[PDB]
Amino acid sequence: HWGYGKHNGPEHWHKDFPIAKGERQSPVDIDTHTAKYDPSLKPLSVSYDQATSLRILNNGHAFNVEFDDSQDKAVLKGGPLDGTYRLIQFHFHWGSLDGQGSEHTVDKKKYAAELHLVHWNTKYGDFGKAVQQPDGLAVLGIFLKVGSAKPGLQKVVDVLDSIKTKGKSADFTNFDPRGLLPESLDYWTYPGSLTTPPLLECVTWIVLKEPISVSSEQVLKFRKLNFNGEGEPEELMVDNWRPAQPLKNRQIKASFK
Numbered sequence: 001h002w003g004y005g006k007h008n009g010p011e012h013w014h015k016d017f018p019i020a021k022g023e024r025q026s027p028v029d030i031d032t033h034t035a036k037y038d039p040s041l042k043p044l045s046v047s048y049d050q051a052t053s054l055r056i057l058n059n060g061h062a063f064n065v066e067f068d069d070s071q072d073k074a075v076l077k078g079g080p081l082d083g084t085y086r087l088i089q090f091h092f093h094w095g096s097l098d099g100q101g102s103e104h105t106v107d108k109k110k111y112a113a114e115l116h117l118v119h120w121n122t123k124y125g126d127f128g129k130a131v132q133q134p135d136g137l138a139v140l141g142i143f144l145k146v147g148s149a150k151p152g153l154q155k156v157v158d159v160l161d162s163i164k165t166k167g168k169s170a171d172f173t174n175f176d177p178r179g180l181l182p183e184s185l186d187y188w189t190y191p192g193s194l195t196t197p198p199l200l201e202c203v204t205w206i207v208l209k210e211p212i213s214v215s216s217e218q219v220l221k222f223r224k225l226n227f228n229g230e231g232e233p234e235e236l237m238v239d240n241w242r243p244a245q246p247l248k249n250r251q252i253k254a255s256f257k
């Protein structure tokens with residue numbers, strides 16, 4: 001089964017998921033000088049005030065904070081998006097060292113981690129139908145750098161001990177994802193894919209320019225998670241990031257000059 005090890009990592013995924021070599025794969029390097037400001041891009045509308053988190057799950061590749069997406073409670077609109085996209089979950093990708101961990105890069109710079117807030121286009125009814133559509137998902141990507149702690153992240157950090165191993169979940173209600181956002185909503189956007197199998201080319205990527213800062217202690221707690229299930233040989237959940245993929249016939253657009 002696919003993962004991030006030497007024998008099942010990103011360079012192997014194409015064998016089970018041939019789209020891995022597709023025309024709109026993610027992540028990508030964001031070459032800031034080649035991205036073009038698009039003045040027709042609208043400001044992002046992040047409406048998370050009514051978000052209902054429910055659970056946090058170690059799925060063996062990352063941990064997902066899941067939300068009630070059965071109503072328009074936490075939605076992403078505007079920016080490059082047509083219509084309304086409902087928040088279904090967020091998760092992170094991170095490194096074994098502070099110098100790596102993000103999936104997108106900025107002028108080849110890797111951040112320590114990257115947060116993905118995953119939303120699906122409500123015109124398709126359910127996430128499973130949305131992923132079959134070229135405009136099915138909008139993933140808001142936020143870089144993490146190591147510095148000062150992110151207070152809004154601590155509630156996540158502190159529950160990780162209860163979901164150390166693959167398949168463990170914990171109740172995780174009343175978490176406010178607004179606490180994970182940076183100050184600015186300036187962004188780059190491009191059409192891409194899920195960065196994990198099945199690698200479907202269904203994502204409008206919206207990557208914020210401003211990283212959030214998290215503390216070394218916070219990211220250290222990410223790195224204590226396990227890819228393995230309980231009672232299996234311990235493999236630390238680190239370096240669960242896919243590297244940048246070829247941009248091919250795509251233009252990255254910037255919301256800002």
Ligand SMILES: NS(=O)(=O)c1nnc(NC(=O)C2CCCCC2)s1
Nearest residue numbers: 088089116118127139193194195196
């Ligand atoms: N790294 S990423 O591009 O943001 C993503 N790659 N696979 C993603 N799958 C999901 O969100 C779901 C998974 C399981 C059930 C519902 C939704 S999200």
Ligand SMILES: [Zn+2]
Nearest residue numbers: 091093116195
């Ligand atoms: Zn992700």
